[PDB]
Design a protein around this ligand. Sequence first.
Ligand code: HEM
Ligand SMILES: CCCCc1nc(Cl)c(CO)n1Cc1ccc(-c2ccccc2-c2nn[nH]n2)cc1
Ligand SMILES: CCCCc1nc(Cl)c(CO)n1Cc1ccc(-c2ccccc2-c2nn[nH]n2)cc1
Ligand SMILES: CCCCc1nc(Cl)c(CO)n1Cc1ccc(-c2ccccc2-c2nn[nH]n2)cc1
Ligand SMILES: [K+]
Length: 463
Amino acid sequence: KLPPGPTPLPVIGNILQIGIKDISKSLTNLSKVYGPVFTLYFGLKPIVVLHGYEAVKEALIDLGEEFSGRGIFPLAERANRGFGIVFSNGKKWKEIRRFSLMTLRNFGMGKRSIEDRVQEEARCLVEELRKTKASPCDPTFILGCAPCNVICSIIFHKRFDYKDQQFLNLMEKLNENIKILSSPWIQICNNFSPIIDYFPGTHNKLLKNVAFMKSYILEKVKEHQESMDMNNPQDFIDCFLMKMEKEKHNQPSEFTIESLENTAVDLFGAGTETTSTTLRYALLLLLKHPEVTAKVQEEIERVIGRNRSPCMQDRSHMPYTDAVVHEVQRYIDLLPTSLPHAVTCDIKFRNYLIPKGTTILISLTSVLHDNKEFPNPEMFDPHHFLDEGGNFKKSKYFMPFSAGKRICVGEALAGMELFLFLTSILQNFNLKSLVDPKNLDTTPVVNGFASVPPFYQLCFIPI
Ligand code: HEM
Ligand SMILES: CCCCc1nc(Cl)c(CO)n1Cc1ccc(-c2ccccc2-c2nn[nH]n2)cc1
Ligand SMILES: CCCCc1nc(Cl)c(CO)n1Cc1ccc(-c2ccccc2-c2nn[nH]n2)cc1
Ligand SMILES: CCCCc1nc(Cl)c(CO)n1Cc1ccc(-c2ccccc2-c2nn[nH]n2)cc1
Ligand SMILES: [K+]
């Protein structure tokens, strides 16, 4: 059989029992009734929900391959999103993923490392923060530019100037699509309808935005072709063309110009917003707990001092910082239900039959907020990642990037941006709150499957 669930209604399945507002709260409530594995219907569509470390680890990790499909909804084809990495399945995905993992290796693309692209961005970021002359600031935009720029430098081999028009509207489009894609109407409700697209105009703005981005990418591709150096690949495009001019005899190939721009658009989509929000929420949390910021600053001072840029080598020497960054990710739980999975064939799971192509919802929340692994899991507290001797304490339960065969492609990259951007910020600034710390609220604003910090302002005071 399928795993037990609330018994559906005919046709609207379980829809009107789900708290649409905070899905992860609802999934957790359900697990109190039906335990760690359970089924929900979203309009005939069966969705098995995994809750808790044990359930998640066995699916994602022990049954890795079987749990490796991307769950597909109406929106997947309504915004043409199954032709890059994030929303691909089968051979197309295996190939572009394995390729993309190779290229995004630290030395994956020539003599400039990923570290060096990030280090550069950290200096520019510190610079822009100086330019605000310690005056009150919504860091939203500035923090957003840094991750967007890292993506640009990884793909086109250039960073941009933060005022370069080509950069601003590239971010605008991305920012537009992101905000749209986070509407519950779009993310959810328009998915209760298999056939009729109920937001034509919206899907249109979505795709028009993609086209702008896709066309800009093509310009850079034509430029990369004319200036090709086979022995000197320098970014993601160079690598991709070389994989092409090499698959030329395996026609037709998973690697085409079209799969390139789609992969690029994927990386811009997956690479900016979540990193950007993670930084924005890190600063919020740092303001709220200035003792925490104080300790990071001690670590920076003692390990890196005020001369050079920080660098990834430093992290092994800065367990307290490391614990902070982890604890930020853990606490804010930005993707409460990851992205959706599908099984790749039919399988028995503990005690059930799950049919090839059935949608799987992983509850990351249940893992990040395990109250035995992380006592008081709703308090922000970097001690969740420290031993009683104050060394870094790894946790199997650290899954803000998911786990298994679909684990975030930017795990190592995001981990480097957060460390370098955070340590550079605090090396060069103290953070002044407007309101008093005691009043400021840091609890996540949840909208469906989306988690976001409260609006806030602060000042970046030089040292
Ligand atoms: C804090 C920053 C980030 C977090 C917390 C994060 C988290 C996630 C999560 C939860 C997934 C879905 C995994 C699943 O399907 O089970 C995901 C997928 C992905 N992330 Fe990230 N991500 C971040 C940043 C990045 C960046 C910087 C890149 C740039 C390469 C990136 C590229 C991707 C890609 C390509 C996927 C899709 C993986 C696949 O389906 O094969 N992400 N990320
Ligand atoms: C018809 C083709 C036009 C596509 C389009 N490109 C851009 Cl750009 C605009 C700006 O609104 N638009 C139009 C657009 C119109 C309404 C929406 C919209 C906003 C809020 C709630 C529902 C809708 C919607 N989308 N489709 N029908 N109603 C979104 C985009
Ligand atoms: C100018 C283009 C802006 C980015 C964007 N707009 C569209 Cl539409 C696509 C296709 O999904 N994309 C690419 C896209 C790829 C992956 C995601 C994704 C990656 C990891 C975690 C969540 C997200 C997600 N998907 N939907 N909203 N946010 C977001 C956007
Ligand atoms: C085809 C792409 C899948 C996206 C999607 N469309 C609908 Cl509808 C569903 C609901 O099951 N879902 C599942 C879903 C889960 C998370 C997100 C998301 C987007 C941006 C930032 C965080 C999240 C997130 N991940 N887990 N919970 N919320 C979006 C959709
Ligand atoms: K319309």
